[PDB]
Amino acid sequence: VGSLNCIVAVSQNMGIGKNGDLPWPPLRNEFRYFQRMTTTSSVEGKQNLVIMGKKTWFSIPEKNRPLKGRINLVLSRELKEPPQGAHFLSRSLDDALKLTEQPELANKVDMVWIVGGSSVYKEAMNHPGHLKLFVTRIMQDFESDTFFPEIDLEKYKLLPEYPGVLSDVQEEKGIKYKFEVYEKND
């Protein structure tokens, strides 16, 4: 199994969802960036794993579920089988990471991408080890009811650039945004 990563799009007031919907209007190139980054795997014969909480899974429009070309794993203690269209179910992020070393997935998974939501990000971000955060900064305030956890910059370094990630300001539908990559190893 390869690197562990979080990927998020977040407004200036730290919002990531409004009743699960994006707080901002849909941004086509931001969507394309998310698909490209989470799907691209260099290791021949493997796919990336996407891990998400139950609410994040059901916030994805059905036409976009499962995230194609990736192994889709949902976290839930209430669910007793993977949701329709998903591939795997784990009770916790720890169990999901443990599963990636079981024979059922050990040689199948390259990169692991945590795609939401708030509590899953928080657990990943505060667990020791090597972790990167791919953060799209939506540079406006938007009404939200779920939020990204604080990034502790004592441990997460903002990288000066990263291959395959544009470094300059983007704009869609009149909304400026930018792509950042953070890395910790503790």
Q: Is 184 assigned a ligand-binding role in the annotation? A: no
Catalytic pick among 22, 27, 99, 133: 22
Applying CB under 6 A, which residues contact ligand 4RI?
A: 7-9, 30-31, 34, 56, 59-60, 64, 115-116, 136
Angstrom distance (rounded) from CA 54 to CA 107: 26
Active site residue 27: no
Active site residue 22: yes
Q: Which residues of 49-73 are buried (b: 16+ CB within 10 A; e: fewer)?
A: bbbbbbbbbebbeeeebbbeebbbb
Q: Is 129 assigned a ligand-binding role in the annotation? A: no
Nearer to ligand 4RI, 45 or 174 (CB): 174
> Minimum distance from CB of 44 to ligand 4RI (Å)?
26
Catalytic residues: 22, 30
Q: Which residues are annotated as a binding site?
A: 9, 15-21, 30-35, 54-56, 64, 70, 76-78, 116-123
